[model samples]
Target: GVSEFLPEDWKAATLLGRIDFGEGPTPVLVRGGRVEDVSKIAPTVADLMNAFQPGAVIPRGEDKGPLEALDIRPVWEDPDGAAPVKLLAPVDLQCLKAAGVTFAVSTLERVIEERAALKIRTLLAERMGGDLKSVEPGSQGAQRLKDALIADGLWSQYLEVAIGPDAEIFTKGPTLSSMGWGDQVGVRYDSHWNNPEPEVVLLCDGSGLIRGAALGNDVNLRDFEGRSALLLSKAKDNNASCAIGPFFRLFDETFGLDDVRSAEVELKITGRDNFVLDGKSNMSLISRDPAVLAGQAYGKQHQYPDGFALFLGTMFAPIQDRDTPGQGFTHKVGDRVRVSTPKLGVLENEVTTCDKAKPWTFGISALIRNLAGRGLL
Candidate 1:
């Protein structure tokens, strides 16, 4: 008889994938044996920028020689994905200042402090009996408290990013105005808004629903002077979009390694995002009339409260069904039967050794033993 078994040694083999997050290889030039104090290079450059012009040109030309040799890396990548990852070499502050380093040390410092503050707030909140909502407002304590709540999973309910009507390519006049109004009124007044380019609202994940939001580029540019030009230039120079945060909130319970890497995403017009299971594509067409696709894929009434019901998108089937003929069959106890076919010869077997007087347990045990003897198990 042929065996359907995998090789035992296969399980012990190492697995490789497209992306390796774990520490793998470091550039040879920056290795400790090759260079002294490679880790201190970035801080050294930062210190020089701070000591000189708080925000001025980084001394690339003067420091490039030694820094290049040291192999210090760039902090970020350009959007075009063309530039190689930079490695900054070690050099003194006086030399770095003379070279004219213009990086935003102040902004970076503030962000780091903010992150620390958030972390602290979260820890304190966790110690207290109350949730994130109970934290005091405007003080360092409140921020930290919110941070703690988010870390504990109370943040998901409040943390939401809504790209408003302005991003929608088209909409009915009334619908457009309603969405636009919601965007302006709802987001503009909220203090937590970070003003991302495409406009997103952040909600705290707890029941109190602490809300925050930021305007899109259009609004930000409209409000501030020469901001759009500055933004555009920054975007171009950086070779990346000006978008911010799909920021993972601490309270987001769904956050995990797999969640961070992949998503059960759908391009939806409206309704529960369609999903395929067991080789069937579930689709819901947009309709003005209610009860159209009823049991199969109906849009929830509340989702289209304003009468703008969008169609549910097509579902992608992930698994295929087996082609075997014995797909669905259940035999009752003592049902004796014979199977005969052209490909397989006649097979005869008594359903039971004992009559109806046998206990049900005996019948089940005998049935299982008989199946095992026939290699069915």
Candidate 2:
């Protein structure tokens, strides 16, 4: 199953990720069907990425196993139960950041939350203004619309960032907080309306150079954010709200940033109650370029010393009614959410409330202690 979870061209791919074999998180590399421990070269994924060089080979250490065995049972089955081998989020020390309102549809979705009938108005404006998706953010045309909207008293903070000179870049979650594959993604129990945002997450080095890419689910609370944008932390970051990995695919001859630009991400949700919903988010429709977004995240003003993982946002917003008509989609407990792209493989997780998901006890200090104990630090 884990073999199938990898890209079809798995033999040629250089994949990086982490796993726990009862000691602590250890970085590993998957080349072809072989899983090799790379902790000796670089203790953490951040270290490995920061020290990475294009076209250079990464020295492999002890062999882990075949890809099939890496697909361990989900930890959500027994939160406290320990397993011999567990897959962890590819990133460890890297800070988690995300770009919001990078998609035209998502921008309208935000407006729909702010003002009910504004959804229709936004659609009309999009038609009248010749599709905001076509208008590059920070362009003269975008500024003209901003000026026109302000004159009409229809300007919004969401719209300002959507097409303004500045992009919406914010911290998604703290380091070592993101959940990996076969893990449970959490939503706030009090959040009545929420959905998964499947996007391409870029892995950057200390110099802000993009080393690779991974699939991520930016689990969100629509109702909470709708109530007030000020509660963004509560709306976005929870116990296991940010779900990333399966593996980090380094740029090679076969795949690179252009592949990400045209990548089509598919989302599938299967609830315990026989509910099924499927949708796709096209990266080509993103308002901001992926490279530009990454540059926006890290420049002279802002820096991520240990490197960072940046979620590039999504166009998929589940407006489909789940239970009640016009109520819109909200996740159910035990809902199986799968986010996948052909090149990146699949990132699958079950949904649970924040309180029920396994508490995040392992922090930076814990990692340092574990690594030092193993003599890797």
Candidate 3:
């Protein structure tokens, strides 16, 4: 924990984390920002998300036991850094969707201005009709813009960075990635032009309803994306394209949409020099409704696994510190990036190499095997 994010003591909370005890990562209830054992009550984090009756979705050979003795250990206890416990991405990441042009009028304006100065266009210009350029984030025009983008058939409602199974990095440990999704680059990729998109990520259930909120880093290779609007899929989606946080703020009965929108977010990239880029954004900055973003994503189209993750776009995009006339700033190796919130823990990772030339398919058998080994199955 960074000095700013760490406090000596705290209150009782419902944050959950995944740590391994030789076998594999197991979900434990986090209390007072410390990991505790919850094996008796629920097998993995999925159990905590179940919110269902005992008889629902039980695996073969596993029974409720006596049908009466409820052996549930859902309580948050003491720290169990019994072995070495490294924080995971916080989101199970069954599926990941990124909302774009969701905020940052300055960023949009900057893009338009830069390209006019000969930098390039927002890529959106090529994807949509003449109407969307004038739209900001929150207005009906904003949604219309999203609708237009969807209609272009040039992109999916959201950018699917990671999907079902074979993506253990989604939760087991993400902030430690050697590379980001087009996030930046290693030798195989280019680092001369890259950007870190910090955002308020929404944690959704099977229904796509906003269940909780956390911090997210949507790293990108702007150079690739900027080449052409059509290259977005290639520019944004790749190995470790996204990451979510040190902790999560579960939206309970008391926390409603307003509360969700009010959450604070902060992002920074630290290199050999001082902070390269420091920025902040909140839920309020989001142009469209949370439900709308979620619906636009998993709405009626894609079948998101069980508990997936959605990256509500960045309110403020990361711009280079040295914005000379023709050059854009890009992150370099050993540069550390952090996306955090006072309520939701901070996620920090170093920039380096992530070869994006790997296969993207995840077989069902592989997923089942991995989950079973982790005690999630």
Best by TM-score: 2
Model 1 segments more than 4 A misplaced: 1-119, 128-196, 199-377
lDDT of 3 by residue, 1-377 (tens): 12343212223444544544445444555444344555445654544555533224422222212211212111012123332334444544346666666554344445346435332334454433333335444444444444544554433323211111111112212222322211233322654577677777776766555666666777777777677856666666656555665445665443445666776778777877564777777777555666766776665556555666667776565445554545756766657677776666566666664563233233345535766765654
Candidate 1 positional error at 65, Å = 57
How well is each residue in 133-244 modelled by candidate 1, as lDDT tens digits? 3432333544554455456554422121101111111111121111111011111211111111112111111111211111111111112212343332221111111111
The better-scoring model by lDDT among 1 and 3 is 3
lDDT string for model 2 (257-300, tens) is 99999999999999988999999878998989999999999999
The window of 10 residues in a row where model 1 has the poorest summed lDDT is: 94-103
Clashing pairs in 2: none
In lDDT terms, how accurate is model 2? 0.86
- Sort the candidates on TM-score, descending order: 2, 3, 1
Error of 2 at 156 (Å): 0.9
Give the clash total for candidate 1.
37
